[PDB]
Write a protein that binds this ligand. Structure first.
Ligand SMILES: [Zn+2]
Ligand SMILES: [Zn+2]
Ligand SMILES: [Zn+2]
Lengths: 187, 72, 585, 133, 186
């Protein structure tokens, strides 16, 4: 606060004050001298309390509106990410079979649970032990959901290759047993 | 005295996990079984045999230099 | 949280403009920030303005407001400057010493490593500052390697020959043996290495360690690595003993190692020992007779390059039992006749960069000339030994310094061990040269060995020199002297036996033209170190400091076993050559 | 959704040996004490959640005695008579913590702060009115 | 706060006021000795205020960033801290069962699987040399885990089965040393 128009008012008021004080004329002339500076120091109080409280509010307004801009940019970012995720995931829809089923609905509505039961081109089965494996995924091909599926890949809880010959009764205790087996819809 | 047993079992399974023993599903499963058995036990003699059993798992590896660590 | 590099006072303040970010005490960091353009200081969290959307990072302009840092504009009403009272506010502030002079640290942290004075100061500053300068130099070198442009295979003209397209906007690295490239192959979403390569002018001729059928899309980049901070000094403080400590010398030794026995004793008489072995003096023979003399000693043989360690292993197979020797190989084809990746044997051979943390009775560091202070620090950090034997010749070639452009690096500034060898003198010296004829030995002894190198062989009367300027032509990164090649052609026609010689030149393009015209095997002087040949033909090809360097000329002319012909362009070294002068046809 | 079945486990939980030693030096955790460690950080194998979903297995299609249930609804309605509530606009919501996860198809990109502060109050009101039909 | 100029101003004002009181001179003159005195705190009670705030405020900032420093280097050395704590606790526990195997591991003997506690299951323990064999294996019995295990198999490191009595002092340097002994609990 030095480039305010009244800083000259300090200049003149205190300059005259010190001049006439070092001169030491009388109090009869010092009354006006010590009242001019007295009203001056109040003038500064007014026009300085009118300014120094403005910078904090301007600064906080810039903070708030800058973070508002940041939030707005993040909004565009998430919009783009969401839309591209939808469009990339839809491209897997395999748009031939699902059309056949939806054409067969009375109005077009079909329960969701049968969409992967009739149209999905891959199956993965998790088996807890060899016994249940015998009942479901024995051999190089099996059946489920009124369809025939053919084995291609088997892994264990450690996501490492294990061959179909390795899953026997006696060799079983040497394997992790949330076994994963993936099969393809045979045609 | 069993309190010390449970505390050292806790620390031992902690270091076992930080040694990435968890990457072997069955090994980590057995170690977790042993830990849960020790903390729930009520007699001190069973705790000793369980803790040495699960410590054999640590001592079978080669990722912790025992001789340097045993500085006395 | 660390220690002052100038005071060793504990401090958690690192300069944010320094590439190595060294810990600097309040006084030292204040002096560094006020005396240099480095105005960034990093702490547990960086000394930067936490104002949203502000760029102020000068610590002289920041205040600790709230629990944060701010500039003048964004500061809260109650704050104090971080950089005041001749210090920068920080941690361990009460425990602070300061430095009277920080000029050396400022120079090291501000130099671009292009002047010889930079390396001179780096080798003559304090040990902590030596480590700091070594870290800064190697980090600067690694960063500068990144400034080069990627060269991609555009076309496969033939095998061992290629066509490369260079990236726009970046300089092309020189195509010589000092810049080893690595090939990357095109894949779906990542890249895979296809081994390390070197390149020369063809089209371009590529020399690969492993041969492939690489196609269009493969490119080559000079591989860089992380430069780890150094803690160990380049040299452990010297201790001299009155008796042999930690060693039990054998009571039966052969005459082949007899000339070294008492010398070997001095190895056990002092904490570390330094050896100067001129070419053909038996440096590896010394290193292995040290092991044979102390058969119960635990020894780590180490060197910067794989080739020196492989030579040590080759000697070990000759004299040391194979069961007690093992070669460490990081996960380049090298010695594979010792067991791989064994630490607890009796004799371990390893490179500096792959040395495990271990203790040894003796550590032998071969060929100290190529070493840097970084290598010395790494060896002293990894290996805890009762005795160290530094083998190598300061009169031989140092490690190339790519960033150096102004000034020449003297042998006393190669490293700490070389500095000791060139100021106080080597603790051990091999004074008998079994390789070169007496003329070459006399020349090198009067040149760099202070007339201390003696010749085992007599004069062969086959050492010749010729004074011929020729014509000097320049390529992008080399020099060619075709008239010197023509002089060599005329000499070969008039002396066909010299067709069994090996052509050695200080320029790779000179070697390429000599191989294309003469047909003789071609070697750069830098590559020729560690090798020996019966007949040598050397052409200086220039009169520059590179080709006129005393160490390089020593190495080049000490490759000959019987005869050497020097087509010389410099009058000084030509007059220094104690050879039989020949006339130009 | 993915091509592999991920397996999650639990960590042992860390031990404060300093407080334990200070406690033992104070005549605690000794034999024959009415105070003993009965609370711990247990661990689990690679099959925990899938071994917890077979606890939702224990639920069955159930009918309730309908007239009794209606009268019970009527009588229970009185225990919430002193209270008051109703719909509020998007400006009157108060959220405890905004740094909490959103869910499967949202956590991938941000936290609930981002979604509350990206969409305006009008959009929130529009979504609220959409969910009413 | 005694090293500030306003402290000197306070001292001068207080000395003047004390002189006025011990003198009792006038009633306006001592007012000028308090018109220019009570203000002498109005430029002493605040320059001694924001700096006093700064003292403790800087203190609270540096101690908190100390705390984050300790929290950030504390988690950077866990792999060694926990293992040293573990082995200190192990050595403090003082049980013969763990001591036997800890010595066996520190010198030459580590199992290849979890040691079973049932009296039927199997163990494989590696014996590096014959010296550890002397201490551990005495005939058909194997003392380990503070328990006895009957030996039914011992095979050297190149998969060639070797009988029990074959091993002794001077014929030991004829086999692949890292033997693996199969045993069954008693
Ligand atoms: Zn300092
Ligand atoms: Zn700096
Ligand atoms: Zn700012």
């Amino acid at each position: 606060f030095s480039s305010l128009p009244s800083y000259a008012a300090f200049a003149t008021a205190q300059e005259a004050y010190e001049q006439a004080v070092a001169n030491g004329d009388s109090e009869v002339v010092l009354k006006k001298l010590k009242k001019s500076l007295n009203v001056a120091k109040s003038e500064f109080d007014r026009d300085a309390a009118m300014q120094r409280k403005l910078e904090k509010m301007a600064d906080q307004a810039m903070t708030q509106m800058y973070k508002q801009a940041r939030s707005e940019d993040k909004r565009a970012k998430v919009t783009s990410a969401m839309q591209t995720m939808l469009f990339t995931m839809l491209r897997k829809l395999d748009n031939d079979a699902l059309n056949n089923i939806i054409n067969n609905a009375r109005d077009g509505c079909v329960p969701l649970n049968i969409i992967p039961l009739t149209t999905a081109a891959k199956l993965m089965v998790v088996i807890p032990d060899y016994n249940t494996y015998k009942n479901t995924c024995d051999g190089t091909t099996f059946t489920y959901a009124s369809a025939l599926w053919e084995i291609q890949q088997v892994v264990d809880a450690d996501s490492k290759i294990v061959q179909l010959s390795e899953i026997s009764m006696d060799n079983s205790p040497n394997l992790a047993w949330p076994l994963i087996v993936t099969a393809l819809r045979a045609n | 005295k069993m309190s010390d047993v449970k505390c050292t079992s806790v620390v031992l399974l902690s270091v076992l996990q930080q040694l990435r023993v968890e990457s072997s599903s069955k090994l980590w499963a057995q170690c977790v079984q042993l830990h849960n058995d020790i903390l729930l036990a009520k007699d001190t003699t069973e705790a000793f045999e369980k803790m040495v059993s699960l410590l054999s798992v640590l001592l079978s590896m080669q990722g912790a230099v025992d001789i340097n660590k045993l500085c006395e | 949280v660390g220690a002052c590099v100038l005071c060793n006072s504990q401090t958690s303040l690192r300069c944010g403009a320094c590439i190595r970010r060294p810990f600097l005490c309040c006084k030292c960091c204040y002096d560094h920030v006020i005396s240099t353009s480095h105005k960034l200081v990093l702490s547990v969290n960086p000394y930067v303005c936490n104002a949203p959307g502000c760029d102020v990072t000068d610590v002289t302009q920041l205040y600790l407001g709230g629990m944060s840092y701010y500039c003048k504009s964004h500061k809260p009403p109650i704050s104090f400057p971080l950089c005041a009272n001749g210090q920068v506010f920080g941690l361990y502030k009460n425990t602070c010493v300061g430095s009277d002079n920080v000029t050396d640290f400022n120079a090291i942290a501000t130099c671009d490593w292009t002047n010889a004075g930079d390396y001179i100061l780096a080798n003559t500053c304090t040990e902590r500052l030596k480590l700091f300068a070594a870290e800064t130099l190697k980090a600067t070198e690694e960063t500068f390697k990144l400034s080069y442009g990627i060269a991609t295979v555009r076309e496969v003209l033939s095998d061992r020959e290629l066509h490369l397209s260079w990236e726009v906007g970046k300089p092309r690295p020189p195509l010589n043996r000092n810049y080893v490239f690595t090939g990357y192959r095109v894949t779906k979403n990542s890249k895979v290495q296809i081994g390390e390569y070197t390149f020369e002018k063809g089209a371009v001729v590529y020399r690969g360690t492993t041969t492939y059928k690489l196609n269009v899309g493969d490119y080559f980049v000079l591989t860089s690595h992380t430069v780890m901070p150094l803690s160990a000094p380049t040299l452990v403080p010297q201790e001299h003993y009155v008796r042999i400590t930690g060693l039990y010398p054998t009571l039966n030794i052969s005459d082949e190692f007899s000339s070294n026995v008492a010398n070997y004793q001095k190895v056990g008489m002092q904490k570390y020992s330094t050896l100067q072995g001129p070419p053909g003096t038996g440096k590896s023979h010394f290193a292995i007779g040290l092991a044979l003399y102390y058969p119960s000693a635990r020894i780590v043989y180490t060197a910067c390059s794989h080739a020196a360690v492989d030579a040590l292993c080759e000697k070990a197979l000759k004299y040391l039992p194979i069961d007690k020797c093992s070669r460490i190989i990081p996960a380049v084809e090298c010695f594979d006749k010792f067991k791989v990746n064994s630490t607890l044997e009796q004799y371990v051979f390893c490179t500096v960069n792959a040395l495990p943390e271990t203790t040894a009775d003796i550590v032998v560091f071969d060929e100290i000339s190529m070493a840097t202070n970084y290598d010395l620090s790494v060896v002293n950090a990894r290996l805890r030994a009762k005795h160290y034997v530094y083998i190598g010749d300061p009169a031989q070639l140092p490690a190339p310094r790519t960033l150096l452009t102004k000034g020449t690096l003297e042998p006393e500034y190669f490293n700490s061990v070389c500095r000791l060898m060139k100021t106080i003198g080597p603790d051990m010296f091999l004074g008998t040269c079994r390789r070169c004829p007496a003329e070459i030995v006399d020349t090198v002894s009067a040149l760099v060995y202070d007339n201390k190198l003696k010749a085992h062989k007599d004069k062969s009367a086959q050492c010749f020199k010729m004074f011929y300027k020729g014509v000097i032509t320049h390529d992008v990164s080399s020099a060619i002297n075709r008239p010197q090649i023509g002089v060599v052609r005329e000499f070969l026609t008039r002396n066909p036996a010299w067709r069994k010689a090996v052509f050695i030149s200080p320029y790779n393009s000179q070697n390429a033209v000599a191989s294309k015209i003469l047909g003789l095997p071609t070697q750069t002087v830098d590559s020729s170190q560690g090798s020996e040949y019966d007949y040598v033909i050397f052409t200086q090809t220039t009169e520059t400091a590179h080709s006129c360097n005393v160490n390089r000329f020593n190495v080049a002319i000490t490759r000959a076993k019987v005869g050497i012909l020097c087509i010389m362009s410099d009058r000084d070294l030509y007059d220094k050559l104690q050879f039989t002068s020949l006339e130009i046809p | 959704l993915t091509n592999n079945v991920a397996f999650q486990t639990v960590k042992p939980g860390n031990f404060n040996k300093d407080f334990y030693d200070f406690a033992v030096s104070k005549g605690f955790f000794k034999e024959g004490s009415s105070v003993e460690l009965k609370h711990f950080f247990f661990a689990q194998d690679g099959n925990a959640a899938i071994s917890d979903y077979d606890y939702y297995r224990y639920n069955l299609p159930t009918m309730c005695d309908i007239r009794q249930l209606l009268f019970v609804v009527e009588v229970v309605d009185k225990y919430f008579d002193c209270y008051d509530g109703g719909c509020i606009n998007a400006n009157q919501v108060i959220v405890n913590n905004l740094d909490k996860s959103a869910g499967f198809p949202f956590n991938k990109w941000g936290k609930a702060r981002l979604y509350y502060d990206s969409m305006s109050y009008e959009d929130q009101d529009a979504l609220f009115a959409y969910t009413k039909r």
